Amino acid sequence: MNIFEMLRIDEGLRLKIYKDTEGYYTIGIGHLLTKSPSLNAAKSELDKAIGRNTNGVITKDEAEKLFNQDVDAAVRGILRNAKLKPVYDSLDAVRRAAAINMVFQMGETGVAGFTNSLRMLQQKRWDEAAVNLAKSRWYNQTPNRAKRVITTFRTGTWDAYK
Numbered sequence: 743m744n745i746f747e748m749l750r751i752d753e754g755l756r757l758k759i760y761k762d763t764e765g766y767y768t769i770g771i772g773h774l775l776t777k778s779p780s781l782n783a784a785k786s787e788l789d790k791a792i793g794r795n796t797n798g799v800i801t802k803d804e805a806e807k808l809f810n811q812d813v814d815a816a817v818r819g820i821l822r823n824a825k826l827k828p829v830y831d832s833l834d835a836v837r838r839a840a841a842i843n844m845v846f847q848m849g850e851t852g853v854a855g856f857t858n859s860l861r862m863l864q865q866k867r868w869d870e871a872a873v874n875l876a877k878s879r880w881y882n883q884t885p886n887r888a889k890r891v892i893t894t895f896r897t898g899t900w901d902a903y904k
């Protein structure tokens with residue numbers, strides 16, 4: 743298991759434009775296209791992302807290319823964020839994957855406001871962290887996914903993904 747395999751499980755793979763759990767146009771392995779309700783707007787973003795006229799369909803290779811970029815960007819975002827970086831640096835590699843997973847899903851601004859959870863993670867109070875993480879819109883809207891990510895933070899193992 744690793745961050746790629748982990749997010750592949752959490753996000754799925756769809757080769758045509760679909761709506762994500764929030765109702766936003768998305769493609770590939772959870773590549774958010776736009777928060778706009780316009781399908782045409784989404785197709786424009788898709789074409790710009792891939793570099794050709796796709797008419798809303800991409801290949802698996804193209805999906806994996808965006809996915810790699812998205813993971814890279816999430817990591818790079820964490821490292822450029824003054825609140826996230828020290829917590830990330832403090833973690834082992836398995837818990838780092840859980841951190842990336844959350845940023846991938848909710849964006850770095852969103853996760854940077856998990857102030858109390860971030861502190862518990864830095865402190866390595868894993869059970870406390872796991873309790874605090876669940877007290878969130880995130881947990882309530884995507885409980886099965888949140889439960890997997892929380893278990894990963896709590897245990898530093900891949901148990902929730904085997």
Ligand SMILES: ClCCOc1ccccc1
Nearest residue numbers: 826829830841856859860
């Ligand atoms: Cl507090 C739940 C998120 O934990 C993170 C820790 C480090 C970087 C990004 C996220």
